[PDB]
Amino acid sequence: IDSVAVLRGIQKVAMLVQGNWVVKSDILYPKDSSSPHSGVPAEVLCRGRD
Amino acid sequence: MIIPVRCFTCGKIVGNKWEAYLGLLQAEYTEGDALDALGLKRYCCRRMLLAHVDLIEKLLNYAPL
Amino acid sequence: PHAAKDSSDPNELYVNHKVYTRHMTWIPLGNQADLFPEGTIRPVHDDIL
Ligand SMILES: [Zn+2]
Numbered sequence: 001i002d003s004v005a006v007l008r009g010i011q012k013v014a015m016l017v018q019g020n021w022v023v024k025s026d027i028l029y030p031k032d033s034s035s036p037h038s039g040v041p042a043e044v045l046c047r048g049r050d
Numbered sequence: 051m052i053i054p055v056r057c058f059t060c061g062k063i064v065g066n067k068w069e070a071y072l073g074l075l076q077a078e079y080t081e082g083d084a085l086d087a088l089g090l091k092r093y094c095c096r097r098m099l100l101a102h103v104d105l106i107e108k109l110l111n112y113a114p115l
Numbered sequence: 116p117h118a119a120k121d122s123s124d125p126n127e128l129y130v131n132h133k134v135y136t137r138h139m140t141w142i143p144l145g146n147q148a149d150l151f152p153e154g155t156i157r158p159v160h161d162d163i164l
Contacts, residue, residue, distance in 0.1 A: 035123075044121040055163055066136075066162040107125075 025049035052106045059094040071099050136163040 014021040025046035033042045055065035067088050074084035085096045122128040131138075141156040 038123045040123050066160045
C-alpha cells in the first residue's frame with residue numbers, strides 16, 4: 001500500500017501529537033453517543049479530549 | 051454503600067477523611083503515601099480506607115431525584 | 116440555578132449534595148444558651164460526611 005495513500009487516509013481520522021498519531025475525538029465518540037459513566041453529550045467529551 | 055464514620059477495631063474518626071483521600075487519589079499521591087500523610091499509623095484505619103468501595107454515587111444514579 | 120452547560124461534576128451541578136456534620140445546629144434548651152457560650156456545643160471534626 002502506498003505511503004501517500006496511508007497518509008491521506010490517516011490525516012482525516014487522526015492528528016499529530018509529538019510525532020505520533022492519535023485518533024480524533026469524534027471518531028471515538030459519535031454524535032449520537034454519550035459518556036458511559038456520566039451520560040454527558042459526546043460534544044463535551046470531544047472538547048475535553050481535544 | 052458509604053464510608054463508615056468510626057473504625058471497627060479502634061474507633062478513630064475516619065469518615066471525615068474520605069474526601070481527603072479521594073483528593074489525594076486525584077493528585078499524584080499513591081495509596082501508601084496518601085494513607086501515611088492522612089495520619090493513619092496503625093493498619094486498621096489504612097485497611098478501612100483502602101478496602102472501602104464507593105457505591106453511594108452508584109445508588110444515587112438510580113435514586114428518584 | 117447557575118452552572119455550566121455540561122457540569123459533569125456534582126459539586127457544580129448541585130448544591131448541598133453532601134450533608135456534612137457542620138450543618139448540625141445546636142438548639143439550646145432553657146438556660147443552656149446562657150450557660151454555654153456560642154461555639155462550644157458543636158461537632159468535633161465538623162467535616163464528617
Ligand atoms: Zn482504625
